[PDB]
Amino acid sequence: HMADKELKFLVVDDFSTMRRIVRNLLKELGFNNVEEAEDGVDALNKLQAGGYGFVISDWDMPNMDGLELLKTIRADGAMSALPVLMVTAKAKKENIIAAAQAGASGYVVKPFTAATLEEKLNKIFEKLGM
Numbered sequence: 001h002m003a004d005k006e007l008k009f010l011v012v013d014d015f016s017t018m019r020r021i022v023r024n025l026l027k028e029l030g031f032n033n034v035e036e037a038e039d040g041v042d043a044l045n046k047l048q049a050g051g052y053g054f055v056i057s058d059w060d061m062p063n064m065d066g067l068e069l070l071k072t073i074r075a076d077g078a079m080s081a082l083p084v085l086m087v088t089a090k091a092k093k094e095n096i097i098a099a100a101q102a103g104a105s106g107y108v109v110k111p112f113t114a115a116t117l118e119e120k121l122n123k124i125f126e127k128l129g130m
């Protein structure tokens, strides 16, 4: 998948406010192909419906948290390389390590600026040749 207008994003957070912020930013960056999920399970359901090229995900969520979601994705042969960008209020160095070691593509701390999200996405795009 390439970082073109068609790239399909899944945006995961248990609060719609954050989802709404991320969706509108993506639109601004020229990405209109964006779905939402409210937790890890909901997320995996949409993901298995196929088509997704990028995940942006919260951490603290009920049912299945973002760290578990990330690990599940990384451990599934069909989606093991799916980019996952964590966007979360968890800022302890030990949260960052756990997510990084689990295979996070990137990590943004809430609250964040439009500029930060764009810079972090582009950083991942470059890294993956998208």
Ligand code: BEF
Residues within 6 Å of the ligand: 058, 059, 060, 061, 087, 088, 089, 090, 110
């Ligand atoms: F709830 Be998330 F981790 F911001």
Ligand SMILES: [Mg+2]
Residues within 6 Å of the ligand: 042
């Ligand atoms: Mg539902």
Ligand SMILES: [Mn+2]
Residues within 6 Å of the ligand: 013, 014, 015, 058, 059, 060, 061
């Ligand atoms: Mn949350």
